[PDB]
Amino acid sequence: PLSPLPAVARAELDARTEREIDRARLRRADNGFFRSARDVESVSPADGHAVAVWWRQMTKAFMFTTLAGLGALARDYARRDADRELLGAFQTVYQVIGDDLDNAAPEFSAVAPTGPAGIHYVWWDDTIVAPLAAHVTEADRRAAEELPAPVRELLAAMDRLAAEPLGSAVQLRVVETIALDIAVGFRRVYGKVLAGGEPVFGEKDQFAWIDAHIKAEGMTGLVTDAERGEEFVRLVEEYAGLWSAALECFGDRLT
Amino acid sequence: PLSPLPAVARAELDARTEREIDRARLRRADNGFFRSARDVESVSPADGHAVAVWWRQMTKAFMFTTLAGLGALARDYARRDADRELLGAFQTVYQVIGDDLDNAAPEFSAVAPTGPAGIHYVWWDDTIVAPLAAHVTEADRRAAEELPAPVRELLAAMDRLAAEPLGSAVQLRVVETIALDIAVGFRRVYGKVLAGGEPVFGEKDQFAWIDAHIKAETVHAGMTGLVTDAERGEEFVRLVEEYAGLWSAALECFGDRLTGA
Ligand SMILES: C/C=C(/C)[C@H](N)C(=O)O
Ligand SMILES: C/C=C(/C)[C@H](N)C(=O)O
Ligand SMILES: [Fe+2]
Ligand SMILES: [Fe+2]
């Protein structure tokens, strides 16, 4: 008979993780990616392509590893009796993943391509990466897929969270905090890509993916005893820490 | 580079898969559950309650272990480059799971309760098990929670498929072939449960879980799309054969309970 933690012990867990996202520099003010996406004057097609290829790999990994995380938790609930409040938080994970995988939310079902082309890392690849690729060399395209070390480190932790029953809770809790600021960075940055002084991204609907996301954008409800509460907090710290370092790695490349 | 098998090979796989479902005697005319559901004159509260408790546990594990099997495949896809056809088959599996977990299909959202009360095993527990449970003694309730052996072997094989990248494809392939006949059978069985002289299910809306399933399975008019080489194809067929046989024996167990002496 699994239950979530009591209400006040769960609210205490929400402050500790909000204080862990603070301590990791993931707010709009404190992370170099967000400022750089505002302050930089323009961005070369090679730089913007490389960031777009890294983002494609990272958001692909996030989608598949959060789903694997949900699966790892499904494995547990198959053998125990979760109470209805836990099942409610479980559905929430399934619904949220369904945006990136299926475009469930109305913000996405409008503009997103149908079928697999609307999976968010594919939609991104098709409408951001691909128009930029035409402006860089084959050698640059190969170089961009050799991911930098802080990007590789985040993907490595994502693969570990794919096997952890709280993995999907840890990943969604941190990524939904920062998702809005990331998509705003991208709207600035990819407006500022000029090939021959001319913007690669000129029309409005070239930003379909970025705009839908800026429009669109509790996980503690999946923590069942106080021990799991502590492994939650620990893993968020590690996870926020690596997300910050990889976002900083974006900023260093735009300058 | 990670693609499905050529359409020619996938049709051979699909034909081998229908052969295994035939050999397992899961078809409408084959399986003792469907026959018994047609034939019996009445069903006792205790017998119907027991089959419902068994079904609650079976559809719960089916939902969770298919989702877990989908998670297993996602782990692989995180580090490979699945092409669009694979990605389309992966989307489909996620959508079908959403029927039981979130009532995604409009035939279910039309009638199901919202939130976790609408998860199909919970919904069944609330609308089928509970009113039967008012008509059985506490000792009979406890006894029904002791799952017979063929039900336990099926649950255990579900647990094994929960880790297999092919698991969700295997479970949906078999279950989507028999779901209509199962739902039809439940409709007949629970239509025949009498308590005083009174039907335990005397109002149309009490059948809403079953009728919704019957409508979803009817109204609608593949999984081999997730197979990426010959070796996975052989494994697929082999696991379908195991899993189909275990469903058949578990349904035969329903049929035996409804024809007890
Ligand atoms: C905007 C940030 C995200 C992680 C999006 N959900 C995506 O699709 O990349
Ligand atoms: C009718 C058979 C099924 C597996 C249904 N999907 C259910 O929820 O039990
Ligand atoms: Fe997204
Ligand atoms: Fe169902």
Locate tokens 């409005």: which residue? A204
Note whether B121 and B56 are within 8 A (CB): yes
Largest pairwise CA distance in chain A: 64
Pull the structure tokens for residue B1.
Answer: 């580079």
- Chain A interface, best mutation among B59, B64, B121, by max A CB count within 10 A: B64
Kindly list the structural domains of chain B, giving each domain's residue range(s) and its CATH number in brackets, ordered by start: 7-257 (1.20.910.10)
Q: What is the C-alpha separation between B211 and B213, in angstroms, rounded?
A: 5
Q: Is A53 exposed, middle or buried (0-12, 13-18, 19+ CB in 10 A)?
A: buried
CA distance A167 to A79: 19
Residue B108 C-alpha, separation from nearest chain A C-alpha, in angstroms: 16
Encoding tokens for residue B239? 């696991």
**Separation between Cα atoms, residue A197 and residue A45, nearest integer Å:** 11
Dist. CA B91–CA B78, nearest whole Å: 14
Q: Cβ–Cβ of A159/B84 closer than 8 Å?
A: no
Q: How far is the CA of A217 from the centre of ligand 3 (A)?
A: 9
CA dist list (Å): B210 to A94, B38, B69, B121, B216: 24, 16, 26, 12, 10
What is the DSSP code string of chain B? -B-PPPHHHHHHHHHHHHHHHHHTT-STTT-HHHHHHHH-S-B-HHHHHHHHHHHHHHHHHHHHHHHHHHHHHHHHHTTS-B-HHHHHHHHHHHHHHHHHHH--SHHHHTTSPSGGGGSHHHHHIIIIIHHHHTTS-HHHHHHHTS--HHHHHHHHHHHHHTT-TTHHHHHHHHHHHHHHHHHHHHHHHHTTBBSSSSBSS-SGGGGHHHHHHHHHHHH---GGGG--SHHHHHHHHHHHHHHHHHHHHHHHHHHHHTT--
A24 phi, psi to nearest 5 deg: -100, 0
- CA-proximal residue: ligand 2, atom 9 (nearest): B59
The DSSP letter of residue A148 is: -
End-to-end alpha-carbon separation of chain A, Å?
Answer: 54
Resolution in A: 2.2
Q: Are the CB atoms for A85 and A4 separated by under 8 Å? A: yes
Q: Which token pair is B249?
A: 């024996």
Of B68, B94, B117, the CB nearest to A101: B94
State whether residue A249 sits within 8 Å of chain B by CB: no
- How many Å separate Cα B243 from the centre of its chain? 11
B65, B114, B108: which is closest to B220 by C-alpha? Answer: B108
Contact predicate B193/B44, CB 8 Å: yes
d(Cα A76, Cα A83) in Å, to the nearest integer? 13
Establish if B23 touches chain A: CB-CB under 8 angstroms: no
Q: Cα–Cα distance between B140 and B148 in angstroms, integer?
A: 14
- Asked if A91 and B115 come within 8 Å (Cβ–Cβ), the reply is yes
DSSP conformation letters of B134-158 = TTS-HHHHHHHTS--HHHHHHHHHH
CA atoms in the 13 A half-sphere facing the CB of B58: 27
End-to-end CA distance of chain B: 59
Task: Report d(CA A118, CA A208) in Å as an integer.
Answer: 11
